[PDB]
Amino acid sequence: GETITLQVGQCGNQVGLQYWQQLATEHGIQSDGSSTPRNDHPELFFTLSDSNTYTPRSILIDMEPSVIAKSTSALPMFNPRNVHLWINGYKYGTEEEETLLNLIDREVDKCDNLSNFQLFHSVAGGTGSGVGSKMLEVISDRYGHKKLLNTFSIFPSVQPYNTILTLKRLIDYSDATFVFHNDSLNRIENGANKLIALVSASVSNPLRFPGYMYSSMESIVSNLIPTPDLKFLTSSIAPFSTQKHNYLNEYDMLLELSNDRYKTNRVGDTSYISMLNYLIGDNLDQREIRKGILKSQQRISFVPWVARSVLVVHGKKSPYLKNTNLEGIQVTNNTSMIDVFTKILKQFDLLIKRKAYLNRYYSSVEEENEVMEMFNESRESVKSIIDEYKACKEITYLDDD
Amino acid sequence: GETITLQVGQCGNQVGLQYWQQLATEHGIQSDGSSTPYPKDINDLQLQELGKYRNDHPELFFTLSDSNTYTPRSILIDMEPSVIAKSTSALPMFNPRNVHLSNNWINGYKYGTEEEETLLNLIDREVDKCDNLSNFQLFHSVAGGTGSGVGSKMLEVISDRYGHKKLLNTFSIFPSVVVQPYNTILTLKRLIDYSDATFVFHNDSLNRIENIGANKLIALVSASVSNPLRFPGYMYSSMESIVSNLIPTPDLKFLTSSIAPFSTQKHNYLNEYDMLLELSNDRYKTNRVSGDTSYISMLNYLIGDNLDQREIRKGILKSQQRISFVPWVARSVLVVHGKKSPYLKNTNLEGIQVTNNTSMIDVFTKILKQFDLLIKENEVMEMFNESRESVKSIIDEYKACKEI
Amino acid sequence: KLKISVSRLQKQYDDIFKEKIENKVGVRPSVYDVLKKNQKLSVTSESLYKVVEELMDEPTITSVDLTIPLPFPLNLVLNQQLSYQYEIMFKLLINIKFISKYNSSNWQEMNYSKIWTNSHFNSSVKKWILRCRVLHSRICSFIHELENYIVHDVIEHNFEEIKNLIHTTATNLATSELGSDINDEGDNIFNGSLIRGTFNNNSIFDSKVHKHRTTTYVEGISTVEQLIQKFLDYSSTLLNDSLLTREESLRQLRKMLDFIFHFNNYIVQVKKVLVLLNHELFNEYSKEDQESIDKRFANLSDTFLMQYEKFGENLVTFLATIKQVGERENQGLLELSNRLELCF
Amino acid sequence: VNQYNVKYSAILFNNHQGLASMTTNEMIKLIDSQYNEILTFLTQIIQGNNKLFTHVYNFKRFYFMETNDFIDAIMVKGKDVFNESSVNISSTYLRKVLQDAIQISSVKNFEYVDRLDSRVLNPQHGNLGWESFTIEYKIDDLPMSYLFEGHQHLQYLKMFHFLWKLRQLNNLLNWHFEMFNELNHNVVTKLSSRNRRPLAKSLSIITSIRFHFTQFLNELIAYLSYDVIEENFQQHIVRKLFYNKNDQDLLLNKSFMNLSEIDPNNDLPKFNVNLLTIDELVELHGTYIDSIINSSLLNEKTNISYIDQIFNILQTIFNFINTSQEFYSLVCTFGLLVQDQEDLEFQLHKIKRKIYKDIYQHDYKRQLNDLKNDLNRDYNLKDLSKLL
């Protein structure tokens, strides 16, 4: 089925520009939307006119026109009709609810069979994070739960308040949320949006370049989310490619994809809940992959109550990329989320006991009570998810004792 | 049949000039009246190695002279000569004989009454050139001065001089000053009494569409309504047949039109299926319509070469469920497969939707409220009372339309 | 099978597969263009588990088949025996694909449907839901592992050899002229060659020698007989590797697929029951007693436990069967046994 | 033909000594060359000078009702001639009607306006003009007329008859609308306020019933025109002639053989259209007509056919029109009056009751419900059932 991309905020718009440039390069679509000389299926991400032009399905949302202007000028094939221009931002989103609801309904009507909503946004984006938090609520309300949502939220490197307020709605409404940290991205680079764009583009490779299996997003996601509570994913990318000293075999890709240094978020000891590895090359040797799967299963520490299966998808490289060597992406579901969530909660508590900057949000007695109850609910939800991820680790998870 | 166009008032003349230039462009008739040779048909395939003949009906509007010169069937009525001078200069094809030259509605109405014989002679002269006349088209503004009074008097004169044996449309433009509400109600009284089908255009909603001039949109809608007549197809091809499909009773005669703006921007509609869904949007209707509206009749125009039947069928099926039909009217959506003029180089589709919904309750309510506020020889006050009662006579009727 | 109109599936398949855009006269059609319109998908009375038993209602998926008539002479190489072995694989793969599509949709509801995602359940129902979600996750992972083995470890891996061989043969023939010249001498042997009579003694040598040694597929396929034989061997490999050739493997596979399908149906019927348990949503759904609620939960306890233990039994038997068959005959099944054992 | 005779006699009798003195390979090659040349010239005539596609398009334009303006002109001009019995109509009146309708409509600029000709088929006493008039497109001046056997033309006149009835009713409803709308302004709105309200209500009821009937007829015509006639034309004529008839023999690329030579010569054109035999042309046009006449809705297959139900609804509409004329006369007699008032009011109530209850509620809604339920049993007609 078709997918709709939502871009919110300055960071979201920049990441989306890189993402769409990568996708258009992979499908050979020119900057003006004209084709270049089919077995691939860009229709899932591009709308095809009866004049042979490809335009992205994405929707651009931002508080200021400079970022949107840069993005549109860089890629002229964006449709201008889809362009629209913390608590203050969220209340502003309430005012524009009708316009945005109709704007999204236009894209849904334009496609034939909708599958999922992609969202590119930054949790630490301030006002834009507020408008994206409202976007999740309105979409989930109007379209129910038949269509799932995927959020490629960028985590932060007064900010604690914003991170908690955005994470409350991220937990409530998102169906499968990727976690990216600028710290680990710049550590890997030792710009940064080119890693997120690459990971997001590769995550959907089996859909755009069909093969024997994994033809739908339901199959890709369902392998990684045993419970709707544990919805945060850790993504790992192998950087050593296109150099002379590349990984010599896909088997070494499978073994060295699990290194903790390549993960896109700060990690000690972790337990894996689910696994799925992407291998993308013109030709793939099966016996190497079998040996690598066996070693990966014998090496990785799974939680007791999970089936303990490692899945390797055999992605196909784009014809428009000339004979490049193998590359691969790893997406995992770990219990390492407790560390980052604990860090966020510690910062939030430290800055909530001290009334440092709450004057910018508490306007009156009723506003004080409103913000206090909202903050308490967000804190309780985050603690609930931490406790759930902690109870997953132990062996008595399925016991009623 | 034949159609006679009458333009009254400055706004009416401004709209009519572009309406006639649009028609002349579609039919390949130059501004001097000279005709252009007809290009070969596109779907009339022919074997291949590897002048007066036509298949349209332009003469339904233009009088074809013995010297192969076309001339519109238009009559221009107003008092200020500047607009008429501009219109004639832009289009020399207009017949000078057809031009007639001379704020309070009463003054204009009395002027029309005193000089009714000359205008009537002009109408009869235009009719005499027509064999098997079909209908009259009126372009006038409900409020604005000359247009209101003169158009109302011409409405009455035409209605009673021919025994109402031919239907009479009305492309009225509603206003977006102390005298304006009086003029609006006074003209709407005669619109109720005499007009057979009224196309309500609201200037504020036209400005809302534009910012995404205002007369160009009116000209486009008016010149696209009659597309089946000028390019005959399987269905309709008669002005009475189109109107009769949207007017269930004489009272529910007020129609409103929706326009798809993006006929030229390179991000135009992908296909017919997309445009069928986009036409129902309330942001491009020419009359402000709320969410409590209900539709009495549906009619969609499609203008393009070799439209895909699968897309149209699927679009009709999807759009039928979305539309909220009045309980006592069967769910029916009709699509007109118009033919694009071969003279036009643009290959993009255009589509105009004409609807008969119940949103008129709010519009006439606003007009009535403004009139009531402003009210707070004696003959004129009696006419005001009569107009108030006549307007209420269809206010309550459109309200009752909701009920089985 | 009988509770649905057969003629509708044909049309709903042709809209997907054999859609067309025409081309002008003189423009050559592609071979894919020619073979698209040939194919026909029809429902047959012979179910998969019955038709495969011969060459040792149920839901319609068990009985939907696909046939492709072929032009002359292409049908001589794609002999009917080869197409029949292809059709069996089509039926098996459609069964597994359908179950995977039933495992994804049920996973969408189990996680995000309002009734399941409701927070206002009591602790007991919460733990019951958690157990059910974990069990369904195990079933999903098992099915994806089985499908991965069948499709990548059996079909693609074997097909690589044929693809390489056929490419080599195409390149070999591209440079080869059509028609070969044969020359001969005057053959003056006459009486030195007639050897008239009953016969010579050379007949014993012809029988003594053997010609069972042919390998290395040098310079690609050189005889049409080998061309047909390669594909027949490929189809036989596909059937043998898949768990359809032995009786133990086929029986275990049939039990496993039946159990998974019935579990999905039971999951669907569960959605109705959960409405009555919690109150916050029962009032909303009823718009259109403690003892009774306790009875409902007690019934669900035993039903869910039965499904859980049945899954364990089927898994144990299936692994044992694969292990014995892989150790005896098939190399491909042995590594699958190792992988599944390392899973659970 | 003479040039061809000389050319190929110079091969049979000069290059060789007859068919007997020819090896089988050369004889087959000669016959193949003759076949290609002959069919090339047959195309260059039939689809060339004769313009087969243009005349088939005109057949579809006129017989299948496409130029609705011309037929509206005929019906408005002949609204009095067709009223009398089929025996009374003479040739001169038909010619006058046809010429007036040609001048009024847009066919006067049509290229082949001369070929048009009207006729009456069966001048029976019991048949009115509407039940016998048929428009005939003369193609006798071309050799193409010998390919098109009379059976095809008879099936072209049957389908025209059905479509003619439908459009006759569609236009009668327009005249009904105009006359009642004019009467509303002339009588009802000027009547005394005491009895204006009941008459206004009755008139509104009548006009709403007319609107319902018009919607039904328009949907039926739209379905036929843009799903049966147009789809069949584009699928069986345009796609057979101009697009490639891809076949299993066209699949084989013979250029794997060296085949450096080409025959008969570069002088023989390639013609952008499939080379069809005479029997192939006859079969092509026969199948194109048969598909339309024997469509799903128009086939003869409640143990009743769809055509019978449609015709029953059409008879309902005819009865409605005939009774509405009586209502027209009674209300205009009510207008003229302003003890007779009570009698006229009673008759008005009786007529309104008859039309509202019997014709609409008792007959039309019941028949339409049965027809809608019948259509849902068919996959093809389910979509039409939802609208119609």
Numbering used by the authors:
A (entry chain Y): 3 to 39, 73 to 120, 131 to 202, 211 to 243, 262 to 338, 340 to 473
B (entry chain Z): 3 to 52, 70 to 121, 129 to 202, 209 to 244, 262 to 425, 440 to 467
C (entry chain a): 474 to 529, 573 to 804, 814 to 869
D (entry chain b): 381 to 681, 687 to 723, 736 to 785
Give the authors' words.
The γ-tubulin ring complex (γ-TuRC) is a structural template for controlled nucleation of microtubules from α/β-tubulin heterodimers. The exposed γ-tubulin molecules recruit α/β-tubulin heterodimers by interacting with the α-tubulin subunits, thereby realising the function of γ-TuCs as structural templates for MT nucleation. For ascomycete yeasts, MT nucleation occurs mainly from oligomers of the compositionally much simpler γ-tubulin small complex (γ-TuSC). Whereas the CM1 motif of CDK5RAP2 binds to pre-assembled γ-TuRCs in vertebrates, the CM1-containing receptor proteins Spc110 and Spc72 promote oligomerisation of yeast γ-TuSC on the nuclear and cytoplasmic side of the SPB, respectively.
In the second branch, 14-spoked oligomers of γ-TuSCs were selected through multiple rounds of focused particle sorting and refined to resolve the full ring of seven γ-TuSC units to 8.2 Å. The atomic model for individual γ-TuSC units within higher oligomers obtained in the first processing branch could be seamlessly docked into the reconstruction of the 14-spoked γ-TuSC ring, which allowed for detailed analysis of γ-tubulin arrangement in the cytoplasmic nucleation unit. Our cryo-EM reconstruction of the C. albicans γ-TuSC oligomer in complex with Spc721-599 reveals a complex that stoichiometrically assumes a geometry fully compatible with the MT lattice. This closed conformation is stabilised by the formation of additional inter- and intra-γ-TuSC interfaces. Notably, the conformational changes in γ-TuSC units induced by C. albicans Spc721-599 (this study) and S. cerevisiae Spc1101–220 10 are overall similar.
